[PDB]
Amino acid sequence: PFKRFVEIGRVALINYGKDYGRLVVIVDVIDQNRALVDAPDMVRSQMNFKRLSLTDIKIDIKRIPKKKTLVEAMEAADVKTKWENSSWGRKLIVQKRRAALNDFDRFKLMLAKIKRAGVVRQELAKLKKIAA
Amino acid sequence: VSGSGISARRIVVDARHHMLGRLSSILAKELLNGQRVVVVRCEEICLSGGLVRQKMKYLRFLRKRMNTKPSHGPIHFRAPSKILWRTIRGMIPHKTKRGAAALARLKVYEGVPPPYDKIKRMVIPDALKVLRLQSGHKYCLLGKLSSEVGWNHYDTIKELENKRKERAQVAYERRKQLAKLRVKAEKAAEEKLGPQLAVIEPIKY
Amino acid sequence: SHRKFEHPRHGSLGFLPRKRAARHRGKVKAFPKDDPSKPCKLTAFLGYKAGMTHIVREVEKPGSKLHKKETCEAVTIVETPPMVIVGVVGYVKTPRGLRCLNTVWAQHLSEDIKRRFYKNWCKSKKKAFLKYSKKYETDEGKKDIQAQLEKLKKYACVIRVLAHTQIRKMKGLKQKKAHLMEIQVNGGSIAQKVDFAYGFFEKQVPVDAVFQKDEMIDIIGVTKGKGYEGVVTRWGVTRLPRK
Amino acid sequence: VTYKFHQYQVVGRALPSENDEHPKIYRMKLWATNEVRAKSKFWYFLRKLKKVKKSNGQMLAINEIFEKYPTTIKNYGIWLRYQSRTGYHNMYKEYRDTTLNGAVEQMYTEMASRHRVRHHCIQIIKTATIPAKLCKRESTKQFHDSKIKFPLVFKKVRPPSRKLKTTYKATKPNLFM
Amino acid sequence: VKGRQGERIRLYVRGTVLGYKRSKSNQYPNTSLIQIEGVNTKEEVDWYLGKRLGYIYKAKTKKNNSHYRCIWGKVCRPHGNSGVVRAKFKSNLPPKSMGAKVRVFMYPSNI
Amino acid sequence: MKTILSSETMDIPDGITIKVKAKQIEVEGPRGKLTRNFKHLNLDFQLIKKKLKIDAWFGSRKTTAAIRTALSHVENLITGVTKGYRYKMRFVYAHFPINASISGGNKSIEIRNFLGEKKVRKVDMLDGVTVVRSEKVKDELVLDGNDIELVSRSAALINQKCHVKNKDIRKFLDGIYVSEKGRI
RNA sequence: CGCAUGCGCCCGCCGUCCGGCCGACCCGCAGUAGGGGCCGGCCCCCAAGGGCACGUGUCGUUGGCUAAGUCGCCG
RNA sequence: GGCUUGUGGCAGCCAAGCGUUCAUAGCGACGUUGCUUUUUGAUCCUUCGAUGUCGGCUCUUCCUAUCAUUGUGAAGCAGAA
RNA sequence: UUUUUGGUAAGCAGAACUGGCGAUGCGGGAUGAACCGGAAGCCGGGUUACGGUGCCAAACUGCGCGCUAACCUAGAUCCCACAAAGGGUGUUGGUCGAUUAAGACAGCAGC
């Protein structure tokens, strides 16, 4: 039993190319290798499945819907909120945030991590002597 | 293939389910760039085409011998580790000093003998069978091929590997329990660390 | 062009090179397969070729021309005085074959065996195994010896005993330096093999404990030497014409 | 945006003469990689079909034809003539693409693969947009399903860019459909 | 805590000397091919263009009370598509340096 | 031409415990338990509830051919643990009677006097297969078991052990042949 | 594994002096037409793209004290 | 020795006919497609400041287009051959 | 290369037009007087030709579609170092015709 299928309404992540990190909706299927995808901020176009990673989100739309119909369907299902709140979608956001930290911000994060590690190690020691 | 370019004292590669030729070409380039490589579990290397074709190829290799003096080569090594070593030798200018030094930086073993049993082992995606061989196509393990051409240590490696895996499972459970004991520690430390967690929150996965 | 007439080649290519053997004592290249269900028993023995004679016996071979008839057949006499066990060695099965783990020797070693460790026994100080023999004299040393034996019981897969001949008992040989070899122990578990070997330390094992009457055995040794030889005698090629 | 093959309408005629001051005007719909090669193939057919060579002909107009709805999916039928190693043959092919330019690109790629036919050994007789109910090839019919549904059996594992490429990794790829 | 003894600050990245600019049948020692750790594309190479390079090695004799020797160079242009770069040094690097490491400094700085 | 979806389904009886995991099917019934390894098939097995569904996605004609093969094998396992399999063999001879000796708890058979030969032919039944001489019929063997492959393969071993050689097999029809392929 | 040279040799220290490192930190197994974690339903995966580490001082200033914690050395 | 393969040698395709009946168990006329360099020719590229020119004897190794031996299929294979 | 005579044919013999080698290195064709590129004072930089970019070995295991599975040493690049007639219910495309919800085909059943 497979968990994800290519179908009309499936939300997919572009895993390769310039559009990497963007969410698109499969609105029609051309052949085995290509699908017709549409997003609120892009023109409807075809792309190969080799550049797509299917997600668990799936909106309820008809084949090749209008942009207004597509936009409201995504908002109704909270596609953006679900993806960003999910662990998979948060990974992409965190990677961008880490790369965007300046020198001063990295120094602050170092101090927080160093202090966090020191306290955690002390807590573990108590859990060792007591809960041997 | 230009090379990994990483700075490491030593690289330990687990060759399980790696394609022989693609693993050889990548490792040959790493060796030529001055990288020291250790390969373990060479008996689990995979060769495309199936056992029958690979067995026939090795039998043709066994035919080659200096008619007037067979001891003068070619030498037909049967063990999986030596077959991998000879495969890499064909991708290196081993008759030059530069090539000879590159080969001297390579170590190959069947199984995982000490001390490498307690050292992190990496994989090479460009040589992995799961990415390079389409499911349903014929392939054979180098250990299986070596046994049929005169390698008699397959059972010995198999028993030692089972013993190592069981010990690794016990060690894995100890770390698994230790991890469960550490999630409690951070929760207890949560009260003390109020400002610190706020800074790490946007960065935590 | 093809050779005019066909005959088999002279000599065997399976006995090459035809060089002088690198040993004087016959080496056992392979020991009998071990059967754990059988009692511990030695697999080999050393002897000395005394000479040949002939015997007469009445054959019992149904369906043979010799049935109930007498036949004269040559026999060889091999003098086999009992051997003395002086040590035990254990091997571990590894991906690179059998590897020697440890060697444990008996407390007392005869002069004849000690001669095997020297090129000039008389001129030497005869220090062999003197320090080794001392640790049998202390409780801590005895514990160490027993610890080594337990180590063999735990890891060893093949057990062989160190045995030497009592060459002094055959004055005709004119030799005092005894011959030492490893004799594999077959039968029983590894623990039984170690206990079997350690129990015979400094004791004698008669030839009857290894072989018996009417059984087939293999004889290993070095053939008679004959020096530099030509192809006709060495390989059996036919002689060329007189002219 | 960018197509390997472009569709052009090429219009030409024989040079006016005293006998014929208004010679017939011929038009063709030709596929080529650019305008220059479209003109060359136009005179090839006029020379061999209407006996009008470029040396005694006149080029009137050349215009590129663009897909009307490049965002929707259409079924395209292509009637073609090609030369094999032993003669000439006619065949009909169907394709699904957003533009007829893509469908023609698929046709050339397929002919090269399944028949070892080079580009210059193919003549396109006719092209058309076939409605779903009038398609003939099963490779096109099976995607005429309102409830089209299937998994991605084969996936290509790779970093989004070569910046995240490393020779060594601590664990093997984790893949599941 | 480790208790290590060594350089306390690292302001350079390591680069591997791959060889010289060459063809299948000719070699040009005046240019060296260097792989910089962490650089995997031609686009990423643009940041390192003009950066100073140092090939540090040990000689048998002592000069200025040290066995260390340094040959200076810089990154000139990218090589290929996989982040390899072409480098020039005050003197052509010896073939012995193949497989050795060089220090890619962060100066001169354009940022 | 890769079909998007090829699927076939079969009905699981009520008194069968079928367990499927990673193309490893285990069937348990009143007669016993049978297990077969289908990891060599690039198919998708699924239990829906009882029915067994096998699907092939974007598979060539060769790949889809294994869908029915997998179902037939599973059906054989179900019949093996419910009804069993019974293969009957008949001795054929013209002059020399064929003497059979069952031994080892019906797990072995020895054939003597085949075409007058003094050689004794010994065949050992495969796991879970028992051979018994029938009494109702003259010169008949009965092989019983749960796995059809083992029972059928055991009969093949007996048949091929008694091949006539250096003779015209058209006239020298001596041998042991399978006469019925049924179930208990 | 045995025995190992008295004006010699082997070890444990202390100094004298001689010929590539820069955090050179990291042990689950197995599968990939799947594998886990929780209550058939819900979650996790979708590359170490991670985690760990005073990671902060002229290879690192002087003089103290030093709770536990981490780390090195030593029977 | 090299190129060539007419000639020599070996092999295949079509099926008129032979085979009591019956194209193809076994054969293959009329045609037609090849292989081989263990025949002989054709050529004159190497060697004429020299590669010792018949056969046998002796000795090793290699080939298969398999004479015998091992395992099998076919028959106008009852058995034997 | 092309036109072309003798010859079964030849890395054979003899002509026609041009180029080439010989007298000439250099890059490619693994290797080669003639093939492909291209002709050259001694150097630095840039860019290419032919040919290439898994390792040997400078440059992608780059981005796309399909075909092939070789239990014959599957196959792998002008000259070029070979293969034919004839066959395959191997597999992939195409062309013509016939049959089929009024019930075909296979099996089953009594046309």
Ligand SMILES: [K+]
């Ligand atoms: K001869």
Ligand SMILES: [K+]
């Ligand atoms: K003799």
Ligand SMILES: [K+]
């Ligand atoms: K003679």
Ligand SMILES: [K+]
């Ligand atoms: K510090």
Ligand SMILES: [K+]
């Ligand atoms: K011929």
Ligand SMILES: [K+]
């Ligand atoms: K001459």
Ligand SMILES: [K+]
């Ligand atoms: K075909």
Ligand SMILES: [Mg+2]
């Ligand atoms: Mg390279």
Ligand SMILES: [Mg+2]
């Ligand atoms: Mg002969």
Ligand SMILES: [Mg+2]
């Ligand atoms: Mg041996």
Ligand SMILES: [Mg+2]
């Ligand atoms: Mg003598």
Ligand SMILES: [Mg+2]
């Ligand atoms: Mg007969």
Ligand SMILES: [Mg+2]
């Ligand atoms: Mg002829």
Ligand SMILES: [Mg+2]
């Ligand atoms: Mg004929």
Ligand SMILES: [Mg+2]
């Ligand atoms: Mg001469």
Ligand SMILES: [Mg+2]
């Ligand atoms: Mg001479």
